[PDB]
Amino acid sequence: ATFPELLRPLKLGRYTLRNRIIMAPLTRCQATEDGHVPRTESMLKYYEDRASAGLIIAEATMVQPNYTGFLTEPGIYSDAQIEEWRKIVDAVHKKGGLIFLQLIHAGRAGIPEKILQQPKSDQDPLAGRLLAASAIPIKDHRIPAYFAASGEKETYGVPEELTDDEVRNGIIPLFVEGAKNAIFKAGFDGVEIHGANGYLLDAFFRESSNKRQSGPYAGTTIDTRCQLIYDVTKSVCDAVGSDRVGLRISPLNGVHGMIDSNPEALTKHLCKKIEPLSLAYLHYLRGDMVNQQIGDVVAWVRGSYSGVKISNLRYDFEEADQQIREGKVDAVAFGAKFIANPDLVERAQHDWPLNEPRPETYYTRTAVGYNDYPTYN
């Protein structure tokens, strides 16, 4: 067998995966701009073609109405959304695959020209507002043209600092409802909490974006920075069962100028803090997409977390295989390689050559660079 450790089944929460080749969450922007409804026609084909994966983690999907970071990403808050997702999940299950939905709040990376143009009036006190841990806008980065309202690069806006009461009673229940919608109604096998990549939860977790001076979510200690990640995940687990809940973090990922001054101590503490939750897994970016911050995230997690360990970032089959054989990680999620290879698992199984990804077409909103990468045959 080509990569015996990587191709071996894995117990994950209440499931047994067929293999340890995980499909990473990948925003591809194939939902409607109006109601963030999945465009079933394309998304069903896309995911069903990739259902040989050990597990699919579906793309970041909104929990708060209209709070869009990506212009055309899907939501999981409305009945319309749930109905299209249910059809997508049924098709993966028909192929025998497993699918978790990633749940996101874009925080300070929300698109100002979309969010700020729903009127500021009640029925929803969170609507019409940019929200984050602190009033610290993303600096010296522009909203990419493929996410921007216009279709041309835009400036991130200045967010409002969430009150302790809005976090506990405004943000957390949206994740809970989003997760119940995902699992109980659309039939998802699980949900992944989006604690990474500069979004709401990561922004509370790392020092650079959390300067709150007081309360349970303060920026002033490692434990209080961990608390929003904790409280969201815990409330979700209570409603849906911990065996159907994953968490993603990226303690070294410098997107949007995110940085913590002690990522090793932060990560290790997070691990001990979420241990009693008995999650289905912890999924982490082992590094920086920019290649600047360094640290062996794999070893930090291995030393302080005893549940399922899913790593990610510039893996190939051989590295994944050998990190699993050495006991460093339990599974590996692949991003770009799944974009380019719907039959990635088959290619591992016969060591077949791999299609090359084309980043230039990652976000077309059409079939081009989305559903046109062929299987090997």
Ligand SMILES: Cc1cc2nc3c(=O)[nH]c(=O)nc-3n(C[C@H](O)[C@H](O)[C@H](O)COP(=O)(O)O)c2cc1C
């Ligand atoms: C087009 C694109 C969309 C992505 N969308 C998401 C997302 O929605 N949520 C998430 O946690 N990470 C997302 N990522 C990060 C990937 O999940 C993955 O961590 C990244 O591609 C690095 O993995 P790789 O080296 O295997 O591609 C995305 C990456 C790309 C290139």
